[PDB]
Each structure stands twice: as C-alpha cells, then as structure tokens.
C-alpha cells in the first residue's frame, strides 16, 4: 500500500526539444510528479552516444540529492528525458518494486557497451539479460546517496563503466542489495530486443507486451540506434490513438490566426522538374489559394526549356498578383540541390519569412484551405497526406531499412487509405511541407543540407533533419490532394497532354470532358430529344475540340474523296469523304478508351436494357468545305448507332446545316460545338446531310457496335 | 455439424472414425456433411460403409461422392497442391459453410481427414470458452502443429519468440494467433460470424492464393480474433509430406503417429462399424529378429509386440535369465567371473546382478547366432522409440552396405555419443555410415557372423562387465587402456550411422523410468542393492550435450528422412 505521493521523477534536459515535450505529455497523462534538472545549462559533456559521455548528469544529481540526503521514506527513480516514454500508472510501478523487494534495480541490456573485458565478472542469469545499463534505476534516497556519493571525476567522463565497476564489487552488492531486472518487468530496452515487443491494444489506452516473457512493462528506454522505433511507438502509447475516441494530441495546440493581423509572411516555392503534364493548369491554380497575395513571396525555379513558353504565358498574371515574384530559367544550369539550397538560404537570411512552404511540381492541392489548416497546426515540421490515384504510392514512408531505404511498416496500408486519422510521426516526407522559420534560423544554421553527398537531395535532407532531433509530422485529417504520375511523358506532339488519358484519368476528364456531362449522366434533364430515337447530350469541352483540330491541321494530310480506298479491306467505299482516320494518327486507342468509358454508361442509361462493350473499327473526322466536297447523299450506316460530335462553332467560323432524316421529316439546323448525337443507323433512320454555304466546319464521327 | 473433406484417406480412416465416434456429446444433437473427391483409393466404400452403419444415431447426414475423376489434370503428382486443387478446396469449404448456415446449426468443426481427435473432451472442452473461432492444439512428433504464431510479410511462417514456449506447454491459457489450421470450430452463434467467407476472396486481399490464408484475411478484416488454447492435451496429427512423395509414405507417417500415440497412452481402438485391413508381417530382409524380454514385465513386451505388428515385422522373441533372482550356485557353475579390478566408472560399485543377467543373455544370443550360422541379425530391448519410415530406411541401408562390400560387423543403430568431440570419420562410398566411437546405451546393434565369431573367440567368460563398456573396448576405442591391456584382441570393426533409428522410450529421471537393468543386487552378497541413481543419473540423454559444433555434415544422407513444411 505504498502511497503515490512519495514518488518523485527526476529527469535532465539541457534544451527543450519535441522529445522532452512528449515525455512531459506521457508523465502528465498518469498525473506523475516529475522534477527536471539542468534546464538551460550548457551541456558540458559531448557526443551523446557516439563514444562516451554523460558525466554531467552524475555531477548534477550529486548536487541534487543533498536536500534528500537523509530522507528514507520516499522513493526516487531516475531516467532519461529524450528517448523514454512511460506506459504504466505509478501504482503498478510501486507494486512491482515492492514485489521485487530489492534496494536498487537497474535496466538490463543485451551487450557490454563501454568495455568487453569485464563480461565474465557478471553473475550468471538463466534466461534474462546479464549486464547492467545506466539508462535508469529505482531505489531509496539513502541507497542512491550512498552509491553515488563516491563520484569524483571529470564532467566528460563516462557513466556506465563507473556504474559497472561499482556493481561488480560483490561485497557492496550484497551490502547495498543491487539487483537487475533481468526479466524486463519494469524496464524494457529496445536496443537488441526489437522482435520481442508487440502492441496490445485496449479500449481507451495502449500498452506494449513482451511475448518472450509475457509481461507488461512500465518504462521503455529505446536507446542505441533505435530512436526511430521509439518514435514510431510514440504514435499510440499511451494516449496516441485509441479505437474509442479517435486520436489524442492532435486538435489542441492551434494558433487559429487571431487578432485580425496580416497573416504571417509565407515563402511559397515551386521546383518544376521532370516535365509534368497539366502544368499550365497548375500555374493557373496557383492564383486561387485562400491567402492574401501581399503576404506570399513566390520563387519559381524551372529546369526545362520545354516549359519555358508556358511560364512565359503565365508570367504577367503572377507578377500582377503576388507581392514579390522571381524566376530562375533553364539557362542558369542549376542542379535541383542548388535550387532548394539557395531558396532555403534566401528565406533563412530574410527575418521576414516565418514559414518556408515548399511545393513540388506534381502535387495538386484540390483542397484550397491547405495552408490555413497547416499553419493552424503549428508543428515544427508538417506535411499534407497525398496519394497516387488508385494505388498505395503515397508521399511518405513508414519505417526505414538499414540501407536508409524504403521499408514497409504495419500501419502504412492503413494510413494510405485513411482508416485511422490524426497526426503521425514519420521518418520521411516529401513533395510538400511547412517548416517553422525558427527551426531554419537557430536549429538549421548550416547551408548544405540537400547537397554534399551522392544521395538524392530529399533523402539527404531528411537524414540531416533526423539526427538533429526534430520530429517530422504527417497529417491526414482532411482530403488534401493527389500525386500525379510522371513515369513516362512523351513530348513529340503539339499537345502531348492528349495522350495522358491512361496515366492520369481524373485530371484528364476534368480538363477535356465537357463540364456538364456528369449532370447529364445522372439524369436532371440536359439531354434533348429533337426527334424520336435521336438524342442530344454534351460530351466534349472547347479545349478538346480546339486541340483536336489543331493536331489534325498539324497532320494536314486530307486523304479520302475517291470512291475507292486502300484503307478499307474491301477497297470499295459506299460513299467517299475528305476524312482523316484515327489509325494513321496513332490516336485510335485513346479514342476507343474514351468511347468505352464515357459513352457506354450514357447509352446504357438512355436505351435501357442494352449492354454494350463499346467496340469500334471505323472512326474519323470529316471537314465540309463549299469547294472540296458537299454534304453526303442519303445513305445508311454499317453500325447499330453512330456518334456525331461537332468541332467548331456555326456562324462564327462556318455557315451551313446539320442532318436531315427522310422518314421523320426531321431537320437539324444548329449543331452545337461540344455536343454529341445518338441515333440508330441500320434500318429505321434514313439520314442525309445538309449542305454548307460559307466557312469551314469540322465533324468527328464514330461507328460503334457494327 | 462435424463435417469433413477427405481424399484418399483410407490409410488411417478406421482409427479416425472411431475417434470421432468416441466424442461424448448427444448423438441426437449431432450431424455430418462428409464428402470425398479426387480419391484414387477405395476410401469411398469405407466411408459409405460407416455412413450407412451410423445413419441412425446422427440427427441428419449428407454426402456428395465425387470419386470421378481420381486426379487433377494439371497435377504434378499425388502430393501436388496446385491452383485448381486450392480453388476446389476453397469452394468445398465455402459450400460446407453455406450448408452449415442453412440448417440453423450452431458451431461447426471442419476437421480434415489427416487429423485425429484422440481425446474424448474435444467438442466438450473446446466449446466452453465462448469464442469466435476457437482451435485445438494438435501436437505431433515434431515442432510443426496447427498453431502458427505470426505472418511476417506475405503469410509466410515467422518464428515468433513464443512458438517454442507455447508448443512445449510452458503456459496454459488461450492466446491469440495470426492463423489456425486444421481443427477449427467456427461458431455460427455470434452475430459477427455472419461475414466470414472462404471461396470468394475479399477484394482487399493482396497475399498469395493459398487456401490456408484466405480464411485468415477474412477473419482479420472482420475483427474476429481467432484465439487458441492448449490447456489440455487434444490429440495428434501427421507432419506434411513432400511435393513428390507417394501415398505409401503418408501411410507410414500415419502408422508412426499411431505408434507415438501408443508410446505413453492406451492404443487407439479403431471403429466397430468398419473393418480393419490388417497387413502381412515380414523380416525386413534380415535373417533373425532377436528380442530380449523380462518375464516379470509384460506391458512393455505387449507394447513391443504391438509395435512389431504395426511395423509389419515378424520377431523371433527371446528370453533372458533373471540376474537379480540368480544365486551364486548357478552363477559360478557357468564360469562367469568378474573382470580383474573392475568397478562402476560413475559410482564405484563392482557390478550388479542385472548386468550379469544382461551379459549372459547377450552371450547366449551371440552363441545362438554363431551356431545357427546367422549371417546377420537384429537384437533389441524392451523399450525403444522407432523412427518414421524405419523399415524402408533400414532395409535400404542394409542392402547398400551388403552390395558395396565392407567389413561391417558392429554397425551402430542406437548409441549415446559420450565422445563429445568433432565429427567422426566417414567410410568411402557409404551413405549415412561413419566409423563408430565410444558410446553408451547400445540397446540395438546389427551384428554379422564374423563379428559374432570374433566375440566368441574373445571369450570374456572370466571377465564380466557391462556390455556397453565391453563393446567400446572390443572396437579398440575404450578410453581407459587398462581394459584393453586386460583384453587380448581388437579385431572388431565397428561402424555407426548418423540417422539414429531408435531412442530410449523413457529418459533417466523421467516418468516411468524403471531402471531394472540398472537397479539390481550386487554380483556378490545380497545386502548391497543400489537404488535408482537420482543425483548421479549421468546417462540421462545424449542430445542436450551434443547440441554443439558436432559437425557430422559430410555423411551422405539417404533419400528418406525429410518431412515438414513452412512451420518447421
């Protein structure tokens, strides 16, 4: 029945980093009594775990205990404050300490770090660990006073070898009842025991379990080269994310931009490279973000001459809009590492930019509130969660292989598809992030972060930011966007974006397909029926039509017109036209894909009971000119139904007429530029074309299910 | 509704049917959904006979015999589980689940044919935990069992830090697992159990296309943690065979499983409704099968006879003179004299009456072998642990030794390697054969006529000592040179086999360790009877101490001695 008021926690932290804050949250979750020592003092030691050190902690505690030199009744427990997160309530810890019954318990470790000679001097242990680790110890105030009063050495001296030499003496060990938790009942060190831990969930809290020994620890000390795995484990234990109550430390600690003051100055950036399709759309989207244009400072570093005309066309709207605008063209011959480095220097050396927010080329932020919510988060680093459409490729990683390369964690597939929500500790982020300017100023003073090695700049940047001890959050609370794919992008066309129908479907449909088409599909009117079994619905937008006619005139070769044919297998056309087929352009397969995906649902909704796989063999574009060829004679089509889509606007470019059905006395006189016609073409509908008068018209025709 | 899914399982059907019938539950509240497919053997008729015989007790029964065809088209062999076989198994399992759901039937135990529910309290104890899918711990002759401990990356078995602590019964109590094969009890009582699907894989499955993992993904993706408990012993199951084996190997494995069940438990009585296909005995290509037995102890003799019958090996049973009951009047008449200055090398006693009786029995057996002109013979004890495929492996080894041609006289079949050292030498052109060395516990030895003649020429009638000590001396490998100096000839050419074909039934200091050959009266007087050596066991087991850099890797391994799958 040990009272909880007699326990005091003593920890050391020269500075205040995110790890110390995490331990603070862990300690206050169970309502502990923690005392901090060496807060703000200069670290008179050196390398924390490279070779040796820790000789200032012992001097600090030697100064400290003098107030409790005779205080027997209470119980004191010492631990690191950078790489330790508590998991259990104080009652369990004190009950376990009472159960053990010794005067002093040390954390057991796998190896002998400081020296190897004294290994045989250790007393034998059956299954548990054998050696002693100075990571933490629990004991009476009198016992710790007696054991550590003898310290008289330099502040740069090591500590674990001192504790080992003290413990190895058998006489004092019997006298002071030194004991080691070999079976990991209280202390569990992750270094060397990485595979014997599994998270054991619960309703409102989490805990860890050692399947080797079937016990639940209270203190974990992820020392050694295991900082990453404890960073991972800190996401859940003990209040991170439970199945009942969502996540934990995610929604508090927000600025919420109060006061009505001008928003903090932001240094936007763009690093267009590996030429990305749909670039002009991205530039025009760079104007509609929800942020005052006087507080944004663009820096656009291009690296391809191919994109030069697009940026040239975009430029004067940008210069008219944001407070400051710059450019670094293809002629400067700068590597991406240099570009990112000089941008980081440019903001770092300007005391006015508080938040350097990078933004790579291919990251479409379909949500326009991203900057607001990110700045509202006030995390030391942060990055929005994005994903390739219809896959698992995201913009972050779960855990790192020993080669510092991509491994696969156990929650990655859960995080990508948004089965859990919060803010997640992550060992690598890319293609979007918001850095707090102070961390640039007095946490990252050195310039060379992206360059200086053979490694890629992003991985090197993360490696540099990791060892300095700054956490890299990732948030997925809302939908932020999606990553495009630039695995292959040919450019030997006037508009090479037209071939992107396979690679990036959503953006292709957004740009080319007529805007109204979805509403027509779901059935709220729009579709017109000027004559029975004849339908009028909008399919294509003006961009598609103008780019298509531009491509066709780029080809220019207006074959066809003679009654015979070489393209036709038979060699005898029913009626000839001045036409350009899609097989010669290389654009036939994409046309078939468009027919399959965007026509079939419409026709299956319009003519209920029909199922169509959308197979086509003949499809072309026809030009009508008053001098070359007139409109067609009455005829019939060798297919179930036909597609008739116009490509230029009547009146403004040509004057003429549409189609003419004999059996219904039907006349189409006003073909629309971006609409499609649907009518059966085998038996019932005898149609003829009206003749053009002035100008030039273009019509796209396809035969489906012949 | 204890259904099943069998294919060519007649090799062990009679015992499995009786074990299933031995369950202590209301027969008016039971059922069966048995079916067979792609069975090349006569398992269909055997199953139909029992189904007709027991058709009255079960509240209902069903069958869909599918004897045609007997094999898959794109099948590598009898043991090949291809994509078509896995798909058929998944479809059959899902059909069994669907039929189990249409009858408003609570709980279902889809136990396969290979498994054998030996204990009677399987369906009585298993359903008492109120679990979603509770599985029984089916033990076996090795590590492999029906309780995996974790999938690493793509359903492959990952040796967790608790599999060994679990299979050894160190901890008792239901512990969750990532997969549970064979004996599952998918209780249809709970509401959440309405989503489990077997045939149609879930759209969110990216692992392999095996049939033992599609159930795991459906179990996990529906939040039904398949617990598993090993509180009490349940039964035994056979280790899987290789992908190019034959049904005879499976039958041998089943027979070995039955023998292992009989090792410490009463024999598994087969079904009464169905018959028993008894086999004909033989001599395994040997000339004589010696068997030393004690008159007082008969349960061990009965077990050995039953094992020989199961092994289809005839035995030339022999008897031994009771050394403990023997007196000096008969002992001195035979001219049996103790060795000069000989005592126990571990305790200090000169000799024992049981040792004298064993030596006399061995001498009589050797004399009988010499008189009969027996070219080869096998001599064993009253307690041994036979290995799987022992008969075929022993016959192949003997045939290879005889065909190659060598002076094999003292080939070792069972020994305790007291010579803790590097690997012994390997004779040329010999498979799994090496030069023998100092060893104890020589209960089994395949001797030849030349070796027996040499032993008779040695004539150690005036020097009595343990046979295990005399044999190493006869092979010119005894550690102490005093015994060799006392001896006169060392012409015996001993040999050893790395794949030991026998082990002691009970180790020293274990359950049922009645050391009749050790605990006996002294050679002289009758008031010196050393009891069982508790502290100084010494010859406990020559396995833990040999778990070191013993090498023995250059010995040519036989095509046999290969089993287990991704699990061991």
């Amino acid at each position: 029945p040990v009272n909880p008021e007699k326990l005091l926690v003593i920890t050391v932290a020269t500075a205040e980093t995110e790890g110390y804050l995490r331990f603070l949250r862990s300690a206050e979750f169970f309502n502990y009594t923690v005392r901090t020592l060496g807060l703000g003092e200069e670290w008179r030691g050196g390398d924390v775990a490279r070779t040796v050190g820790g000789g200032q902690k012992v001097r600090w505690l030697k100064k400290e205990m003098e107030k409790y030199a005779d205080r027997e009744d209470m119980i004191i427990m010492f631990v690191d404050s950078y790489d330790v997160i508590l998991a259990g309530s104080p009652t369990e810890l004190l009950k376990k300490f009472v159960q053990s019954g010794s005067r002093l318990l040390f954390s057991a470790e796998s190896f002998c770090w400081p020296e190897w000679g004294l290994a045989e001097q250790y007393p034998e242990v059956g299954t548990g660990k054998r050696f002693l680790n100075s990571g933490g110890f629990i004991g009476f105030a009198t016992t710790i006073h007696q054991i550590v009063r003898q310290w008289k050495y330099k502040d740069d001296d090591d500590d674990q070898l001192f504790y080992t030499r003290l413990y190895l003496d058998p006489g004092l060990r019997e006298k002071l009842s030194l004991n080691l938790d070999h079976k990991s009942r209280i202390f569990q060190n992750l270094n060397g025991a990485l595979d014997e831990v599994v998270l054991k969930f619960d309703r409102n809290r989490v805990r860890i379990r050692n399947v080797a020994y079937d016990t639940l620890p209270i203190v974990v000390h992820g020392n050694g080269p295991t900082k990453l795995q404890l960073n991972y484990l800190g996401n859940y234990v003990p209040n991170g994310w439970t199945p009942e109550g969502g996540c934990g430390f995610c929604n508090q600690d927000r600025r919420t931009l109060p006061g009505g003051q001008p928003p903090p100055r932001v240094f936007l950036a763009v690093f267009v490279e590996q030429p990305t399709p749909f670039l002009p759309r991205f530039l025009q989207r760079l104007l509609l973000l929800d942020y005052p244009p006087d507080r944004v400072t663009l820096f656009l570093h291009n690296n391809e001459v191919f994109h030069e005309p697009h940026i040239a066309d975009s430029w004067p709207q940008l210069q008219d809009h944001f407070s400051a605008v710059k450019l670094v063209g293809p002629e400067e011959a700068l590597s991406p590492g240099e570009a990112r480095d000089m941008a980081m220097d440019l903001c770092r050396q300007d005391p006015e930019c508080e938040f350097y927010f990078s933004l790579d080329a291919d990251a479409v932020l379909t949500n326009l509130q991203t900057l607001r919510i990110l700045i509202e988060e006030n995390r030391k680093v942060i990055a929005p969660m994005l994903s390739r459409h219809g896959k698992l490729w995201s913009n972050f990683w779960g855990a790192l292989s020993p080669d510092e390369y991509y491994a696969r964690s156990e929650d990655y597939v859960e995080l990508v598809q948004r089965k859990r929500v919060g803010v997640w500790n992550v060992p690598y982020i890319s293609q979007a992030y918001v850095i707090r300017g102070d961390t640039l100023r007095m946490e990252l003073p050195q310039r060379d972060v992206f360059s200086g090695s053979d490694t890629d700049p992003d991985m090197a940047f993360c490696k540099s930011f990791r060892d300095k001890g700054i956490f890299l959050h990732l948030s997925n609370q809302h939908e932020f966007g999606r990553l495009l794919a630039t695995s292959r992008y040919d450019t030997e066309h006037l508009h090479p974006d037209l071939w992107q129908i396979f690679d990036n479907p959503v953006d292709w449909k957004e740009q080319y397909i007529h805007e109204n088409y979805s509403r027509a599909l779901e059935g709220e009117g729009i579709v017109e029926q000027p004559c029975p079994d004849v339908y009028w619905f909008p399919l294509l937008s003006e961009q598609m039509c103008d780019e298509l006619v531009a491509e066709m005139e780029h080809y220019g070769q207006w074959s066809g017109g003679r009654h015979e044919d070489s393209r036709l297998a038979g060699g005898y056309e029913n009626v000839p036209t001045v036409d350009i087929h899609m097989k010669q352009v290389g654009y036939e397969d994409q046309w078939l894909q468009l027919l399959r995906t965007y026509v079939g649902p419409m026709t299956e909704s319009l003519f209920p009971g029909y199922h169509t796989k959308a197979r086509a063999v003949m499809n072309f574009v026809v030009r009508y000119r008053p001098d070359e060829q007139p409109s067609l004679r009455p005829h019939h089509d060798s297919s179930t139904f036909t597609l008739n889509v116009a490509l230029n606007h009547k009146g403004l470019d040509y004057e003429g007429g549409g189609c003419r059905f004999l059996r219904y006395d039907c006349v189409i006189s006003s073909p629309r530029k971006g609409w499609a016609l649907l009518h059966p073409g085998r038996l019932t509908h005898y149609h003829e074309g009206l003749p053009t008068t002035w100008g030039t018209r273009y019509i796209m025709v396809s035969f489906v299910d012949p | 509704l204890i259904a099943l899914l069998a294919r060519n399982a007649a090799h062990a059907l009679p015992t499995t049917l009786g074990a299933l019938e031995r369950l202590r539950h209301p027969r008016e509240r039971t059922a069966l959904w048995v079916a067979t497919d792609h069975n090349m053997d006569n398992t269909s008729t055997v199953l139909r006979e029992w189904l007709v015989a027991v058709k009255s007790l079960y509240h209902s029964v069903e069958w869909r015999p599918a004897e045609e065809p007997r094999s898959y088209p794109d099948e590598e062999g009898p043991k090949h589980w291809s994509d078509s076989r896995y798909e058929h198994v998944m479809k059959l399992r899902q059909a069994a689940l669907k039929s189990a759901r249409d009858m408003w039937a609570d709980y279902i135990l889809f136990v396969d044919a290979d498994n054998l529910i030996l204990n009677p309290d399987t369906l009585s104890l298993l359903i008492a935990e109120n679990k979603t899918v509770v599985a029984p711990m089916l033990d076996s002759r090795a590590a492999y069992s029906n309780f995996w401990c974790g999938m690493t990356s793509q359903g492959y078995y990952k040796r967790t830090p608790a599999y060994i602590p679990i299979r050894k019964r160190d901890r008792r109590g239901c512990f969750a697992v990532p997969m549970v094969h064979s004996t599952f009890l998918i209780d249809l009582r709970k509401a959440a159990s309405r989503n489990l699907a077997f045939y149609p894989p879930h759209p969110d499955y990216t692992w392999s296309f095996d049939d033992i993992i599609v159930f795991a993904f459906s179990c996990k993706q529906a939040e039904v943690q398949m617990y598993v408990c090993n509180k009490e012993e349940y039964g035994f199951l056979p280790v899987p065979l290789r992908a190019h084996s034959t049904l005879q190997d499976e039958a041998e494995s089943f027979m070995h499983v039955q023998l292992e069940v009989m090792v410490k438990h009463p024999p598994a009585e087969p079904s009464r409704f169905i018959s028993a296909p008894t086999k004909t005995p033989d001599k395994m290509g040997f000339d004589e099968v010696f068997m030393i037995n004690l008159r007082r102890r008969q349960d061990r003799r009965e077990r050995m006879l039953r094992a020989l019958q199961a092994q289809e090996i005839e035995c030339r049973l022999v008897e031994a003179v009771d050394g403990k009951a023997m007196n000096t009047s008969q002992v001195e008449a035979l001219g049996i004299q103790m060795l000069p200055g000989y005592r126990d090398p571990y305790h200090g006693r000169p000799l024992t009456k049981g040792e004298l009786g064993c030596f006399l029995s061995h001498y009589n057996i050797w004399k009988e072998v010499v008189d009969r002109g027996l070219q080869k013979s096998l001599v064993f004890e009253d307690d041994l642990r036979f290995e799987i495929f022992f008969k075929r492996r022993l016959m192949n080894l003997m045939r290879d030794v005889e065909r190659e041609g060598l002076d094999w006289d003292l080939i070792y079949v069972g020994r305790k390697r007291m010579q803790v050292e590097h690997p012994e030498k390997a004779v040329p052109r010999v498979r799994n054969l090496v030069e023998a060395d100092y060893s104890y516990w020589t209960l089994a030895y395949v001797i030849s006529l030349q070796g027996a003649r040499k032993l008779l020429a040695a004539e150690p009638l005036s020097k009595m000592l343990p046979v295990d000590e005399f044999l190493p001396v006869m092979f010119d490998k005894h550690p102490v040179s005093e015994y060799k100096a006392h001896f006169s000839l060392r012409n015996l050419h001993a040999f050893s086999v790395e794949p030991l074909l026998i082990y002691p039934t009970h180790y020293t200091g274990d359950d049922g360790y009645v050391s009749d050959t050790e605990t006996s009266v002294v050679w002289n007087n009758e008031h010196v009877k050393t009891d069982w050596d508790r502290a100084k066991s010494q010859k406990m087991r020559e396995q833990q101490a040999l778990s070191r850099e013993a090498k023995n890797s250059d010995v040519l391994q036989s095509p046999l001695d290969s089993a287990a799958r991704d699990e061991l």
Binding site: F201, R408 | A191
Partner: peptide, 19 residues
C-alpha cells in the same frame, strides 16, 4: 515491419433465436 499489432475487438452480441 517492426512491433506488429494485436488489434483487439470485443465479442459480438449473440444472434436472435429462430422461429
């Protein structure tokens, strides 16, 4: 692939009786 989880779900309620 470090520190695998033991995602815990409670037992579902018993299903309704037949009629």
């Amino acid at each position: 692939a470090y520190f695998p989880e033991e995602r815990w779900s409670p037992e579902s309620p018993l299903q309704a009786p037949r009629v």
